[PDB]
A paper describes a structure:
The three human oncogenes, HRas, NRas and KRas, encode highly related membrane-bound Ras protein isoforms that act as “molecular switches” cycling between GDP-bound and GTP-bound forms. The GTP-bound active form has a high affinity to downstream effector proteins, such as Raf, and triggers the mitogen-activated protein kinase (MAPK) pathway. This GTPase signalling is terminated by accelerated GTP hydrolysis catalysed by GTPase-activating proteins (GAPs). Tyrosine phosphorylation on Ras by Src kinase is known to uncouple Ras from upstream regulation and downstream communication.
After unsuccessful attempts of crystallising a BeF3– GSA complex by co-crystallising RasWT-GDP with Be2+ and F–, we adopted a new approach by soaking RasWT-GDP apo crystals with 50 mM BeCl2 and 0.8 M NH4F for 1 to 2 min followed by flash freezing. In this complex, the α2-helix (residues 66–74), which overlaps with Switch II in sequence, deviates from the one in the Ras-GDP structure by 42° but it adopts a conformation highly similar to the GTP- or GTP analogue-bound unphosphorylated Ras structures with an angle difference of <7°. This demonstrates this RasWT-GDP-BeF3–complex is mimicking a GTP-bound GSA state. Therefore, it is highly significant that in our RasWT-GDP-BeF3– GSA complex structure there is no second water molecule within 7.8 Å of PG. Only the isolated nucleophilic water is in a near-attack conformation (NAC) at PG along with the two waters closely coordinated to the octahedral catalytic Mg2+. This NAC water has an in-line angle (O3B–Be–Ow) 161° and is 3.5 Å from the beryllium atom. It donates an H-bond directly to T35 and F3 and accepts a H-bond from Q61. It encompasses broader steric and conformational effects, significant for the biological roles of this crucial PTM of Ras, especially for its interactions with effector proteins such as Raf. These two BeF3– GSA complexes both capture a “closed” conformation where Y32 in Switch I directly interacts with Q61 in Switch II by H-bonding, different from other ground state conformations as depicted by caged-GTP, GMPPNP, GMPPCP, or GTPγS. Indeed, utilising 19F NMR on BeF3– GSA complexes reveals that Switch I predominantly adopts a “closed” conformation ( ~ 90% occupancy) in solution. The 10% population of RasWT-GDP-BeF3– GSA in “open” conformation explains why we could not crystallise this complex by co-crystallisation after many attempts and why its structure has been missing in the PDB.
Author numbering:
A (entry chain A), B (entry chain B): 1 to 166
The structure:
Amino acid sequence: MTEYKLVVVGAGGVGKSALTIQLIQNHFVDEYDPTIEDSYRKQVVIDGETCLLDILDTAGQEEYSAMRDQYMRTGEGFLCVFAINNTKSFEDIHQYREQIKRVKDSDDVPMVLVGNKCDLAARTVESRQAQDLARSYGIPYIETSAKTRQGVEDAFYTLVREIRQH
Amino acid sequence: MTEYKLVVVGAGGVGKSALTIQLIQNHFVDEYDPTIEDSYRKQVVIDGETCLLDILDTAGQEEYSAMRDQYMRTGEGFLCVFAINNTKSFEDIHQYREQIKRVKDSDDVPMVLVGNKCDLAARTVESRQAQDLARSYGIPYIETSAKTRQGVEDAFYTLVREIRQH
Ligand SMILES: Nc1nc2c(ncn2[C@@H]2O[C@H](COP(=O)(O)OP(=O)(O)O)[C@@H](O)[C@H]2O)c(=O)[nH]1
Ligand SMILES: Nc1nc2c(ncn2[C@@H]2O[C@H](COP(=O)(O)OP(=O)(O)O)[C@@H](O)[C@H]2O)c(=O)[nH]1
Ligand code: BEF
Ligand code: BEF
Ligand SMILES: [Mg+2]
Ligand SMILES: [Mg+2]
């Protein structure tokens, strides 16, 4: 059992908790209950390795956020989530990544860019724009839907692979 | 705002996680995935006081028993859960109480005894038996169903009152 410390970050309402709860429960939360901080420990097998995923589900609402540097220091990899119908949330990614790099003293931090709510027909962030940003960072981009479950295991398992391969 | 460190304990499969998830997320989970350790932070008003509930959902599977001393040290109140269709879980919850007292070095630790799965017809632990045990401890007894949501808020809120009145 190999422990991986995953942290899920991004603006309020983008789907951090919904993605995480899908991974853990195979349930879609329809309600938006702004997170303070929840943590999970989930055993999974990824490429034949028994993994203990320590997942921190963080506050994206500024009103509820505290002490981001602390959880950035301890995290091994970061799921950086935006919503494809929220341009501001995409712009906020860049700031999350900058802060993570600063806290880690490194531009090579395990990270996956997640464009969530890909079940929504009306999007404002085109896939290619996000693919381009991820390419600039040298990290994977995965499109997800917590509603349909598209990409949920892919996003988390890819992040594990990025940590393993670090 | 007052923080309350609640810890949900008891044998594997009695419904600790299902209760916690009902309280927070207002849905019932049918699949059983044994907990390692999960934590939730949730703000609520109880008896005219704004409270931050820090809820630790613990492992009942004995393979994770090494983690107990730590969470028993830090926890302020314990939701002691058994299932009304599982007599072994009732016997076990007595040992949980004894262990908590030992770790705290105190006979008066805030606790609530919870008889879960009270939606099931095939009861093997009579309410009177659990009432007798709770009376011996000097603590409340509440019957719950994570499936129907019966008693769920009552259980957690009663535990907060037990801490406040300690
Ligand atoms: N249509 C759609 N709604 C989503 C999706 N992910 C989350 N939501 C909804 O978006 C809201 C906020 O999700 P939540 O995970 O609580 O946000 P966060 O934890 O603050 O990032 C809730 O109402 C969810 O039901 C998604 O992939 N598709
Ligand atoms: N009928 C019924 N099943 C329940 C109830 N609470 C939990 N369960 C089921 O019992 C199993 C174990 O629940 P879980 O919360 O994971 O147990 P834990 O190991 O104590 O956390 C799951 O299949 C749940 O769906 C309840 O109140 N009624
Ligand atoms: F949990 Be979300 F960031 F409000
Ligand atoms: F989460 Be249970 F105790 F397996
Ligand atoms: Mg959230
Ligand atoms: Mg559990």
